[PDB]
Amino acid sequence: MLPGTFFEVLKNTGVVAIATQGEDGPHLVNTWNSYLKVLDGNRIVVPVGGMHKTEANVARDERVLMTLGSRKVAGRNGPGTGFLIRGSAAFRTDGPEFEAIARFKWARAALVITVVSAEQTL
Amino acid sequence: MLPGTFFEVLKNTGVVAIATQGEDGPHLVNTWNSYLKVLDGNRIVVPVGGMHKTEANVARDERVLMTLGSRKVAGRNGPGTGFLIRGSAAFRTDGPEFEAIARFKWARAALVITVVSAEQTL
Ligand SMILES: Cc1cc2nc3c(=O)[nH]c(=O)nc-3n(C[C@H](O)[C@H](O)[C@H](O)COP(=O)(O)O)c2cc1C
Ligand SMILES: Cc1cc2nc3c(=O)[nH]c(=O)nc-3n(C[C@H](O)[C@H](O)[C@H](O)COP(=O)(O)O)c2cc1C
Ligand SMILES: [Cl-]
Ligand SMILES: [Cl-]
């Protein structure tokens, strides 16, 4: 599900954005490119310190969107690219998906996104 | 209302994320930090090439969220910061707000976000 160009983006620095659906509109939070941990089976794991509103949204609607990119990875028509990822999210406080990001001692949980599609948008 | 630290983030490269309310959940698109033009009266202007789905969403619900950041600008508790911006959006196709981004020869419109709040989230 995740292409090589996505893994090239993860070798570079940047701001990741994660959109969820809430009762009165979308919500949008961040992490860093370097914090994402990709697992077998199309999973992207994010260390969670805050994400309280995000977690409440995900408990009611698991579908999330994530974007990320880098000036330093070539896109289709010149330098710079990024991705729109769609997937289903879950929060974990134990098990191997939590252990994947437990090195971040500030992490109360892991946000685990099981990818359904990845689109290179540039 | 946009603070100095936000303009510091704009001196740096990065991926900007813009969330809108879609018919069946959020939508999320991107631009680059360096593409944003800030005008007086709390306005952030983005060059629009695609964004047809985003534009349809804004016509139904003008409220948008935007995030952006940089590893190179100090946050409250170490290196790296970013912002959550909430505002209302409109799409201009002539006049000073369009001229503000017309340097992008591929632009079909200017996305004008009038900022209601800016929160440094790191
Ligand atoms: C560049 C950047 C990176 C961030 N990294 C994280 C992160 O890895 N994990 C986290 O929980 N919050 C991180 N934050 C803060 C979140 O974006 C968010 O503001 C916070 O978790 C509160 O989430 P909520 O609004 O869903 O309650 C980061 C913020 C920025 C601007
Ligand atoms: C890093 C990055 C920068 C982008 N810059 C722009 C931009 O400045 N303007 C634009 O219209 N689309 C830009 N795109 C593409 C949009 O994110 C989006 O995929 C496209 O405009 C289609 O919008 P829509 O899904 O609302 O129809 C960029 C994509 C990436 C990954
Ligand atoms: Cl990073
Ligand atoms: Cl940039």
UniProtKB/Swiss-Prot annotation, chains A, B:
Keyword Transport: yes
Iron-sulfur keyword on record: no
Origin superkingdom: Bacteria
GO cellular component, one term: cytoplasm
Pfam families: PNPOx_N
Ranges annotated as spanning the membrane: none
Keywords for this protein: Cytoplasm, Electron transport, Flavoprotein, FMN, Transport
SUPFAM superfamilies given in the database record: FMN-binding split barrel
Cell compartment(s), UniProt: Cytoplasm
Cofactor: FMN
Entry function: Functions as a redox protein with a potential of -325 mV.
Name under which the protein is recorded: FMN-binding protein
Species this chain originates from: Nitratidesulfovibrio vulgaris (strain DSM 19637 / Miyazaki F) (Desulfovibrio vulgaris)
